[PDB]
Design a protein around this ligand. Structure first.
Ligand SMILES: [Zn+2]
Length: 217
């Protein structure tokens, strides 16, 4: 099931009953995030490139599920994750992030996220269980990953590259050398990964991490 706008720049696909992947095209590069349908509202992982697309993504998602987006997990301080921050705060949406993501968001001129996530944080929204983990520096200094224990789905964000992506992308903010260590921790930490959602690209599996470590070699 893949619903999207009239323009084709915002689509949402279903991974499982309550787990969907949202995708928006911007600077055109596709960037994914998650949309979790819970008994107590909708929880998103990552917003979009800007407030226009973020608003629209939210408008869309809420109309479809007839629920309000209560929380969003910002995996890092780049426009494609925290770009719609101003929107989330005028709509009463709680934008969680590590303290680091928050200070770097302010640095890049974005409105500051909550900065509440610890290296390991377990959130439970109604029935949905979410875990955020900070494996260390990689694609960026602050990047974290999301683990849905009930579906064994790992959102690697931009720490994980896609199957046919042979470029690491913007490494000016990246710590190319520590990047590999960080994927090891994710790998060591979660020993029964099923699906893995990359920052840009198709949903893969634990193989996407190995692919990334390969591009880093
Ligand atoms: Zn990024």
């Amino acid at each position: 099931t893949v619903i999207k706008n009239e323009t084709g720049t915002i689509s949402i696909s279903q991974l499982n009953k309550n787990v969907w992947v949202h995708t928006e095209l911007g600077s055109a590069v596709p960037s994914n995030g998650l949309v979790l349908n819970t008994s107590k509202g909708l929880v998103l992982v990552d917003s979009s490139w800007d407030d226009k697309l973020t608003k629209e993504l939210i408008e869309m998602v809420e109309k479809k599920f007839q629920k309000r987006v209560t929380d969003v997990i910002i995996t890092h301080a780049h426009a494609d994750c925290i770009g719609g921050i101003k929107t989330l705060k005028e709509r009463g949406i709680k934008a969680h992030s590590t303290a680091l993501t928050a200070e770097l968001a302010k640095k890049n001129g974005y409105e500051e996220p909550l900065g509440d996530l610890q290296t390991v944080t377990n959130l439970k929204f109604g029935n949905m269980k979410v875990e955020t983990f900070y494996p260390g520096k990689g694609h960026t200094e602050d990047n974290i990953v999301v683990w849905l224990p009930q579906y064994n789905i790992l959102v690697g964000g931009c720490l994980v590259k896609s199957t046919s992506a042979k470029d690491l992308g913007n490494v000016a903010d990246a710590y190319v050398n520590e990047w590999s260590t960080s994927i090891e921790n994710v790998l060591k930490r979660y020993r029964n990964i099923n699906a893995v959602v990359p920052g840009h690209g198709e949903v893969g599996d634990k193989g996407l991490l190995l692919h990334t470590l390969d591009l880093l070699k």
